[PDB]
Amino acid sequence: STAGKVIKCKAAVLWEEKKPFSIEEVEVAPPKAHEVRIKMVATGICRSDDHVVSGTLVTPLPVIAGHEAAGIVESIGEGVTTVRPGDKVIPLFTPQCGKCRVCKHPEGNFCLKNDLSMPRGTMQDGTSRFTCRGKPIHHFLGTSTFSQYTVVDEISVAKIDAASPLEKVCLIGCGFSTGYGSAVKVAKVTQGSTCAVFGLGGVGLSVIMGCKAAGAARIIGVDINKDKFAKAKEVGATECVNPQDYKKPIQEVLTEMSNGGVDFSFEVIGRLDTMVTALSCCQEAYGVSVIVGVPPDSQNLSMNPMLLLSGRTWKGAIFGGFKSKDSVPKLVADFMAKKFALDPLITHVLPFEKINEGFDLLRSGESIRTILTF
Amino acid sequence: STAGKVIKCKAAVLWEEKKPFSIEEVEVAPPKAHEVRIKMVATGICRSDDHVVSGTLVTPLPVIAGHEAAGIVESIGEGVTTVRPGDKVIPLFTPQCGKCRVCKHPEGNFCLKNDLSMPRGTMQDGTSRFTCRGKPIHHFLGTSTFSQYTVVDEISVAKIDAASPLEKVCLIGCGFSTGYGSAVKVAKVTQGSTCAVFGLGGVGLSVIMGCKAAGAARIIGVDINKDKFAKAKEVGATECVNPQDYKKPIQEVLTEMSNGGVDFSFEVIGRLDTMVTALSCCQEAYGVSVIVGVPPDSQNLSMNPMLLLSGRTWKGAIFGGFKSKDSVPKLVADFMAKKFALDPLITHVLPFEKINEGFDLLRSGESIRTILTF
Numbered sequence: 126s127t128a129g130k131v132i133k134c135k136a137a138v139l140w141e142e143k144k145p146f147s148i149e150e151v152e153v154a155p156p157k158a159h160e161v162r163i164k165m166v167a168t169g170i171c172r173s174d175d176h177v178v179s180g181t182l183v184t185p186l187p188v189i190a191g192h193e194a195a196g197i198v199e200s201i202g203e204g205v206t207t208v209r210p211g212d213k214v215i216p217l218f219t220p221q222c223g224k225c226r227v228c229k230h231p232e233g234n235f236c237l238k239n240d241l242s243m244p245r246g247t248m249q250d251g252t253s254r255f256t257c258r259g260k261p262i263h264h265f266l267g268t269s270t271f272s273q274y275t276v277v278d279e280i281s282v283a284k285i286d287a288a289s290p291l292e293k294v295c296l297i298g299c300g301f302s303t304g305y306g307s308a309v310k311v312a313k314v315t316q317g318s319t320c321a322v323f324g325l326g327g328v329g330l331s332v333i334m335g336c337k338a339a340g341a342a343r344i345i346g347v348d349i350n351k352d353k354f355a356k357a358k359e360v361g362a363t364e365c366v367n368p369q370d371y372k373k374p375i376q377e378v379l380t381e382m383s384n385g386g387v388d389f390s391f392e393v394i395g396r397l398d399t400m401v402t403a404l405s406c407c408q409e410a411y412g413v414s415v416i417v418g419v420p421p422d423s424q425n426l427s428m429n430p431m432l433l434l435s436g437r438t439w440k441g442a443i444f445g446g447f448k449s450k451d452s453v454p455k456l457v458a459d460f461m462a463k464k465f466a467l468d469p470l471i472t473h474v475l476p477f478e479k480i481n482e483g484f485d486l487l488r489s490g491e492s493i494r495t496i497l498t499f
Numbered sequence: 500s501t502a503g504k505v506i507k508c509k510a511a512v513l514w515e516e517k518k519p520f521s522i523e524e525v526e527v528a529p530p531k532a533h534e535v536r537i538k539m540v541a542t543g544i545c546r547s548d549d550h551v552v553s554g555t556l557v558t559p560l561p562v563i564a565g566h567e568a569a570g571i572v573e574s575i576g577e578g579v580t581t582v583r584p585g586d587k588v589i590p591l592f593t594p595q596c597g598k599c600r601v602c603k604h605p606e607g608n609f610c611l612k613n614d615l616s617m618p619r620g621t622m623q624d625g626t627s628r629f630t631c632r633g634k635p636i637h638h639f640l641g642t643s644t645f646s647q648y649t650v651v652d653e654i655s656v657a658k659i660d661a662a663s664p665l666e667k668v669c670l671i672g673c674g675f676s677t678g679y680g681s682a683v684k685v686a687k688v689t690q691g692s693t694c695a696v697f698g699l700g701g702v703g704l705s706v707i708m709g710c711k712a713a714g715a716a717r718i719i720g721v722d723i724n725k726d727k728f729a730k731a732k733e734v735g736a737t738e739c740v741n742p743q744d745y746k747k748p749i750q751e752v753l754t755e756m757s758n759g760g761v762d763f764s765f766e767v768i769g770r771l772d773t774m775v776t777a778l779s780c781c782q783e784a785y786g787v788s789v790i791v792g793v794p795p796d797s798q799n800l801s802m803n804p805m806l807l808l809s810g811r812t813w814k815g816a817i818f819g820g821f822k823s824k825d826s827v828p829k830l831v832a833d834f835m836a837k838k839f840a841l842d843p844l845i846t847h848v849l850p851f852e853k854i855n856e857g858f859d860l861l862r863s864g865e866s867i868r869t870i871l872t873f
């Protein structure tokens with residue numbers, strides 16, 4: 126039995142920026158009060174994990190990254206009521222405490238207990254459950270899924286259907302839900318509308334899935350990598366455009382294509398310039414632009430506020446606007462009822478031991494999602 | 500009588516930036532097809548007219564400015580169906596053609612026939628109806644109300660109640676409707692919410708009126724001129740704050756006052772820095788900030804898009820989001836039924852001939868609205 130004991134297991138540790146992950150033995154402490162220890166089954170490789178490597182997303186190092194995963198509860202600490210040993214779970218990089226002003230609001234989801242805004246790299250109690258070579262290792266977004274076992278706060282875990290296929294539903298822990306909700310919940314895409322989606326990776330494809338589900342008439346995919354276009358069309362894009370093919374700025378191209386601007390635009394890359402391009406291509410009087418991508422730390426964009434004065438709306442969101450603990454189980458149940466597909470997002474499945482290879486696939490442009498299996 | 504003939508009348512001509520208006524004789528051509536010639540009765544002095552003088556708002560010179568007014572139809576050109584000679588009317592600085600994609604959209608109000616985005620200073624046909632000293636004079640926003648007579652396109656005029664008091668309802672042509680609609684229609688302020696309003700001039704007072712009408716529980720007025728606070732409180736502000744009194748930036752002050760950020764914020768000044776401050780002071784996960792003020796021409800702001808990623812919504816609007824020709828008559832009807840008050844906005848009355856005194860009152864900070872009578 127492992128309950129109540131330190132577990133020694135394999136994890137991918139990031140010791141410093143711009144280096145490969147190091148796969149090595151770590152010690153995982155047992156869960157304290159209101160904590161849950163989880164045996165990982167599958168974890169996705171998301172661009173946000175790469176942002177930690179590149180220094181785009183700043184978080185204390187050394188760290189165990191990973192935030193898009195599914196696993197099985199190994200043990201629970203004192204006071205836990207929402208999961209039990211053996212339950213299938215998805216860790217939540219955006220928590221849902223249920224008590225703060227945001228959790229109580231009908232349209233907020235960025236719970237005040239999050240570790241995103243001012244990252245400490247710890248459990249809620251300010252300590253870490255991980256050691257490696259005698260040194261404490263930081264957590265990442267209260268999840269740390271690049272490990273055979275992790276410990277999370279109860280407010281950062283959701284119980285899901287016992288029959289769920291974990292090697293697929295791990296994507297509901299980040300990329301699918303983010304993109305899909307960004308369309309259906311944050312933008313509230315309307316039937317008949319024209320949408321433009323900038324960036325055709327895993328999250329961008331999921332935005333397209335949501336735009337199509339919402340009944341958009343036209344969905345224009347935008348990417349500098351034309352190898353992404355075929356899959357974008359498969360999941361609903363009506364047209365794709367490569368900005369490098371044009372002599373004019375792409376906002377001008379898109380405004381012309383849509384006979385005066387799109388209804389909804391989405392920035393799903395993480396570049397300041399594309400955020401402003403995306404806003405500019407939506408119709409000046411009634412367009413809505415949603416920022417999904419994460420830009421480099423501490424950099425400001427420059428924009429003319431006349432773009433907003435005419436009537437545009439600009440907004441952003443974390444995790445598709447979903448309240449995480451309420452929504453994740455419902456999304457998994459919807460998946461099981463065949464309401465959306467996840468297979469189009471999964472291009473590679475590798476053992477956890479090949480994590481660095483998985484990241485190379487992402488960086489070279491070849492993969493959408495690689496799933497790592499434990 | 501005068502129908503079909505050139506009218507010689509007095510107008511306030513702006514020959515050059517940063518100079519006083521010149522009150523002098525102009526020739527006003529008769530209306531062409533689908534145009535209306537109006538005898539002005541009252542016009543307000545709005546900060547946007549002053550922006551023309553200062554070069555904040557760029558429009559071709561020389562010009563007859565003025566955009567917030569009411570008058571009586573003198574004659575109609577061929578094909579006009581929506582007004583007749585003798586009708587009381589308000590000119591519309593934002594037109595409503597009824598045919599373009601914006602006019603047909605349920606939310607949009609920034610009609611594609613506007614002269615705001617790319618100002619030409621002409622009638623819809625590209626020509627001027629004004630001459631002074633033998634020289635053509637530009638129009639302003641298709642209205643030009645600083646003249647005893649003006650000519651406007653039919654899509655830029657609304658017929659109002661025959662019993663309307665024109666010296667009050669001129670404010671429905673700009674400042675009242677703008678502020679009130681920015682609250683009730685653009686932001687959609689909710690019952691029980693906390694609002695912050697930056698700028699306590701006529702437009703900002705009207706935002707406060709709208710916030711109160713929508714049932715806000717707290718309305719925090721923000722102005723560097725503490726002489727503005729008494730009237731703000733009279734129309735519904737619960738508290739006022741002067742940024743100059745604080746060592747900390749006012750977004751921090753307001754976030755603290757509202758226990759984590761306000762529900763709705765409004766920028767009603769026209770400064771780049773306050774646009775960003777107003778966005779920052781709304782609650783990071785669910786706050787909404789509306790830009791109403793007009794910024795200096797062609798200048799960009801700088802901001803961190805993480806403000807949006809957390810969940811904030813940023814939007815702007817012209818004319819409070821109201822479809823102009825549909826809305827103005829209804830607003831006047833509602834004023835006549837005592838559904839809102841305009842007197843709190845009107846601090847000074849002057850004859851048209853004292854226009855330059857009226858602008859001096861605005862510039863010194865002493866007035867809210869001065870109404871000029873012809």
Ligand SMILES: NC(=O)C1=CN([C@@H]2O[C@H](COP(=O)(O)OP(=O)(O)OC[C@H]3O[C@@H](n4cnc5c(N)ncnc54)[C@H](O)[C@@H]3O)[C@@H](O)[C@H]2O)C=CC1
Binds near residue numbers: 176
């Ligand atoms: N807001 C949230 O809650 C979340 C945000 N993220 C962020 O969303 C973004 C997308 O994530 P993934 O889809 O995993 O990334 P990805 O790297 O798989 O996809 C990005 C796509 O953008 C394209 N691209 C790069 N530069 C471009 C340019 N100038 N113009 C057009 N396309 C360009 C790439 O070719 C690529 O296909 C990342 O910034 C990530 O950090 C991810 C999930 C959650």
Ligand SMILES: NC(=O)C1=CN([C@@H]2O[C@H](COP(=O)(O)OP(=O)(O)OC[C@H]3O[C@@H](n4cnc5c(N)ncnc54)[C@H](O)[C@@H]3O)[C@@H](O)[C@H]2O)C=CC1
Binds near residue numbers: 792816
């Ligand atoms: N979006 C639209 O359709 C419309 C926009 N406008 C714009 O709305 C703005 C306000 O117009 P009015 O109320 O007529 O102007 P106003 O000049 O009477 O009022 C502006 C207020 O801002 C205050 N102020 C100046 N600097 C400040 C600072 N740093 N912090 C806090 N307060 C500051 C002033 O003391 C003043 O009371 C103008 O920019 C005008 O051009 C006016 C009507 C229509």
Ligand SMILES: [Zn+2]
Binds near residue numbers: 227228237238
């Ligand atoms: Zn919470």
Ligand SMILES: [Zn+2]
Binds near residue numbers: 172173174192193299
């Ligand atoms: Zn992610």
Ligand SMILES: [Zn+2]
Binds near residue numbers: 594596600601611
């Ligand atoms: Zn129109």
Ligand SMILES: [Zn+2]
Binds near residue numbers: 546547566674
């Ligand atoms: Zn005005």
